[PDB]
C-alpha cells in the first residue's frame, strides 16, 4: 500500500515500463483501427 505521490515527485519517480508499453499499445491500436475505419468510408 504505497502512499500517494506529491506533484513534485514527477521526473524523480516514474511509471513502470510495462504499464507504459500497455498504454502505448492501446493508443496505437486505437489509431490503427480509426485509420482503417476511415479507409472503409472513402466509398462508404
Amino acid at each position: 500500500g504505497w502512499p500517494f505521490c506529491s506533484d513534485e515527485d514527477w521526473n524523480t519517480k516514474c511509471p513502470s515500463g510495462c504499464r507504459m508499453k500497455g498504454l502505448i499499445d492501446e493508443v496505437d491500436q486505437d489509431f490503427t483501427s480509426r485509420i482503417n475505419k476511415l479507409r472503409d468510408s472513402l466509398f462508404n
Binding site: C14, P15, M20, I24, S41
Partner: protein, 47 residues
C-alpha cells in the same frame, strides 16, 4: 551521446542513458492529443 557538457549528472559507469518513463508518458500525451485531433477532422468529413 551523453557527455559531461550536455548531461550534468553523467556517470558513465552506470551505462548508456535513456529517456525516463516520465518522458515517455509526456511524449505519449502530446502525440496522442495531436493525432486524435487530426483523426477527428477526417471522421467529421467521411462520416
Amino acid at each position: 551521446v551523453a557527455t559531461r557538457d550536455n548531461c550534468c549528472i553523467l556517470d558513465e559507469r552506470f551505462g548508456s542513458y535513456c529517456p525516463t518513463t516520465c518522458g515517455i508518458a509526456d511524449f505519449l500525451n502530446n502525440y496522442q492529443t495531436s493525432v486524435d485531433k487530426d483523426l477527428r477532422t477526417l471522421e467529421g468529413i467521411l462520416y
